[PDB]
Amino acid sequence: MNLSHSHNFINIRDMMRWVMLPSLQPSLKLALEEEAWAAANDFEDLMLTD
Amino acid sequence: QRPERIKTTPYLEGDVLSSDSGPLLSVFALQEIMQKVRQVQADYMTATREVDFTVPDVQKILDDIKALAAEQVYKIVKVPSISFRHIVMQSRDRV
Amino acid sequence: VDVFIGACSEPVYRIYNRLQGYIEAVQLQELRNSIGWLERLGHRKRITYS
Amino acid sequence: FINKRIVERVRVGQILAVLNRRFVAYKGKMRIMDITQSLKMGTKLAAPTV
Amino acid sequence: QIILDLKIDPGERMDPAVRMVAGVVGHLLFTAGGRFTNLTQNMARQLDIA
Numbered sequence: 001m002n003l004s005h006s007h008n009f010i011n012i013r014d015m016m017r018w019v020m021l022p023s024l025q026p027s028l029k030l031a032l033e034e035e036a037w038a039a040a041n042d043f044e045d046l047m048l049t050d
Numbered sequence: 051q052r053p054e055r056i057k058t059t060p061y062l063e064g065d066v067l068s069s070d071s072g073p074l075l076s077v078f079a080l081q082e083i084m085q086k087v088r089q090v091q092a093d094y095m096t097a098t099r100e101v102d103f104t105v106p107d108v109q110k111i112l113d114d115i116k117a118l119a120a121e122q123v124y125k126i127v128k129v130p131s132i133s134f135r136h137i138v139m140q141s142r143d144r145v
Numbered sequence: 146v147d148v149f150i151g152a153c154s155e156p157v158y159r160i161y162n163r164l165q166g167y168i169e170a171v172q173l174q175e176l177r178n179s180i181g182w183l184e185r186l187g188h189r190k191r192i193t194y195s
Numbered sequence: 196f197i198n199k200r201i202v203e204r205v206r207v208g209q210i211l212a213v214l215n216r217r218f219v220a221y222k223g224k225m226r227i228m229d230i231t232q233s234l235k236m237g238t239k240l241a242a243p244t245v
Numbered sequence: 246q247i248i249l250d251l252k253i254d255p256g257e258r259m260d261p262a263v264r265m266v267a268g269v270v271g272h273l274l275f276t277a278g279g280r281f282t283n284l285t286q287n288m289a290r291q292l293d294i295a
Contacts, residue, residue: 003080003111008101009224029123094233098226147220152213165219179234184290187237193291194237195253238253243261 076108249275249284251291268295 001007024030040046057063084103091098136145153161183194205212221227271292275283282289 003106004083005101005103008099011222011224032123091228094228094230096226096228099223147222149218149220150214151216151218153216153218158216161218183234183237184287188294191240191242192237193240193251193253195251236253238255240264241261243265 073109077105080105080108248282248288250288264295268292271295 043049084105088103090096138145186192187194271284275289277284277289284292
């Protein structure tokens with residue numbers, strides 16, 4: 001990703017545009033990561049509360 | 051091995067001058083891009099943030115992607131975790 | 146371009162507003178006119194401007 | 196007698212009462228370079244001789 | 246994806262005839278057609294003068 005040293009030339013509305021573009025490559029790790037994020041949508045299983 | 055390189059007539063047969071390759075033009079093309087932006091920023095009064103222009107090793111990068119294919123996110127184990135423990139107190143038959 | 150509101154003196158702010166009004170015109174048409182004029186002189190005088 | 200508000204005593208709430216100058220600032224991730232000297236680069240085409 | 250230009254250089258001194266011959270070779274090696282281009286609007290202008 002830093003083959004053209006583009007890590008220093010990105011403004012705040014370009015990295016926000018990447019997180020909203022729907023394109024995912026399904027694999028074993030993504031099928032194992034999205035299940036891990038589903039178990040943390042309450043934060044009480046993360047020892048964090050309000 | 052290929053049907054198109056069989057050179058029968060001596061028209062296309064000529065002298066070899068130099069050579070080129072894939073992993074050599076990949077490091078050459080990134081040099082000629084980063085040398086140009088380091089040349090016009092030395093001849094004129096430019097005012098930007100200091101960004102170093104180092105040419106990365108491409109062959110080391112492509113090897114390290116290939117080593118990531120041998121990773122294993124799972125693991126083989128004989129027994130599961132402990133997952134539960136008990137604290138004793140002065141009481142018997144109640145913990 | 147980030148625009149905010151600060152504080153400067155009155156006879157110096159007119160110099161700052163006229164300078165930034167010049168650079169707003171250079172990006173529009175003064176650069177394209179100057180480079181587009183050397184191509185007409187180098188056509189005439191047998192010069193090649195880079 | 197000078198009709199210029201050089202020094203006025205003022206309350207501490209009206210310290211930020213002089214914020215009325217619209218400043219136009221540029222981004223940190225873009226660049227500004229002076230190409231005034233770039234209008235002189237160019238070679239002269241010689242005439243073909245015998 | 247890759248477009249060419251001219252690289253005016255004052256240090257190098259060539260025969261005047263090598264420019265005029267290389268205005269012919271550029272017109273039958275490159276491509277500035279209706280689909281893609283191999284060369285800039287300026288690089289294709291110095292070939293028509295050549």
